[PDB]
Amino acid sequence: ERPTFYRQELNKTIWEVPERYQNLSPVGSYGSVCAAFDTKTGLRVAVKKLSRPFQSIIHAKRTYRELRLLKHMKHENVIGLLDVFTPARSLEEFNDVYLVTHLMGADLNNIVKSQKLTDDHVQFLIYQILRGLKYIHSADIIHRDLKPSNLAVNEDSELKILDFGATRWYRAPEIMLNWMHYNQTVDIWSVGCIMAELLTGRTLFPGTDHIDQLKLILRLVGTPGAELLKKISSESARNYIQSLTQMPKMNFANVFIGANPLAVDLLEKMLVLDSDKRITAAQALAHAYFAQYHDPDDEPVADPYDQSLESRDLLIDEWKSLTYDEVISFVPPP
Numbered sequence: 001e002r003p004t005f006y007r008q009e010l011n012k013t014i015w016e017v018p019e020r021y022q023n024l025s026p027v028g029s030y031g032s033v034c035a036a037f038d039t040k041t042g043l044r045v046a047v048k049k050l051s052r053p054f055q056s057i058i059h060a061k062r063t064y065r066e067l068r069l070l071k072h073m074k075h076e077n078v079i080g081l082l083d084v085f086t087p088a089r090s091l092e093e094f095n096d097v098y099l100v101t102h103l104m105g106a107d108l109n110n111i112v113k114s115q116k117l118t119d120d121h122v123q124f125l126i127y128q129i130l131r132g133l134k135y136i137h138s139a140d141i142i143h144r145d146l147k148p149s150n151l152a153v154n155e156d157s158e159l160k161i162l163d164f165g166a167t168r169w170y171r172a173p174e175i176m177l178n179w180m181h182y183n184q185t186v187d188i189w190s191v192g193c194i195m196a197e198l199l200t201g202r203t204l205f206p207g208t209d210h211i212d213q214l215k216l217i218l219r220l221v222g223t224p225g226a227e228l229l230k231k232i233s234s235e236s237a238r239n240y241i242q243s244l245t246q247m248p249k250m251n252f253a254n255v256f257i258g259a260n261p262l263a264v265d266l267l268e269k270m271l272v273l274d275s276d277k278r279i280t281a282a283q284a285l286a287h288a289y290f291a292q293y294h295d296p297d298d299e300p301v302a303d304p305y306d307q308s309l310e311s312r313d314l315l316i317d318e319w320k321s322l323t324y325d326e327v328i329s330f331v332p333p334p
């Protein structure tokens with residue numbers, strides 16, 4: 001039935017968790033996190049107690065979005081939920097939400113440490129990012145903030161996409177410019193930036209501020225062509241682009257000296273200024289770069305995700321009751 005809970009003071013609050021979660025050890029103070037050992041499954045886990053989840057309409061709305069999103073994500077290369085619990089026995093005593101996931105003690109920076117990786121290692125890591133992206137994108141979700149710190153990787157370089165949200169170095173140029181109709185290929189831009197860095201051992205676009213970032217990008221990809229200029233709604237944006245000194249797109253072979261030509265080719269297809277022209281995640285997985293990994297029969301797709309439900313304007317007690325239903329309805333994975 002209901003598990004037996006135990007109480008323990010941790011992170012300046014009294015945590016109340018199932019007996020199955022042992023040796024809680026704080027690893028951070030959105031919400032505070034402890035590392036634990038799950039005696040039921042035999043896994044090391046991260047247990048997150050949400051901070052102030054139902055303090056305001058906004059916090060309530062965010063708690064619900066976060067829970068619904070994590071419950072929906074069921075893929076090897078994306079973070080998922082091992083468990084969700086509340087010590088509450090009713091809606092009326094319900095106030096705290098805890099989320100449980102695989103403990104991931106390293107991100108892509110922790111494993112890569114500014115060093116060149118081998119080409120075979122890059123194929124495996126990027127393959128996994130694109131396999132997870134195919135799945136996220138198939139749900140009609142855009143990550144919007146893919147970077148090394150949002151990618152968990154175990155010592156065996158098995159990788160999961162996360163969202164915890166220099167922080168600007170992997171952002172698509174349109175995002176830097178506050179465009180308002182992004183497509184999924186904003187994430188593909190980020191993947192190109194990550195991929196370039198893994199190969200070379202160096203940040204591709206290490207901008208010092210917002211405008212320097214755009215400057216570095218344009219130096220590599222070129223100033224916008226006529227086709228792209230035709231798609232610019234903003235009269236000021238237009239005027240500005242028209243007064244630029246046309247630089248040709250650099251040749252990526254003379255930037256990524258030494259690299260597998262297949263890698264250089266993929267990067268050319270990812271880092272195209274015009275978002276409409278960037279390769280998609282599904283296309284990228286079929287690219288010859290990934291021949292040793294690609295398997296069309298095990299690159300699964302998600303059920304559709306309804307984002308209008310979290311975009312409602314509801315009362316706190318309404319979001320709290322809806323979040324409660326989500327807690328109670330959780331079914332752990334096999």
Ligand SMILES: N[C@H](COCc1ccccc1)c1csc(NC(=O)Nc2ccc(F)c(Cl)c2)n1
Pocket residue numbers: 030033046047048069070073078079099100101136141143161162163164
């Ligand atoms: N700061 C916590 C500490 O980790 C502990 C923990 C424990 C249990 C459950 C979750 C996290 C954290 C890190 S990552 C995360 N949440 C998401 O990444 N959500 C999310 C949103 C949109 C997406 F598209 C995807 Cl792919 C993922 N929260």
Ligand SMILES: CCCCCCCCO[C@@H]1O[C@H](CO)[C@@H](O)[C@H](O)[C@H]1O
Pocket residue numbers: 173174179181182183224228231241273274275276
């Ligand atoms: C200073 C020049 C910056 C380059 C302009 C960004 C081009 C990005 O590409 C643009 O993406 C938009 C956002 O989804 C789409 O609506 C457009 O169709 C697409 O061309």
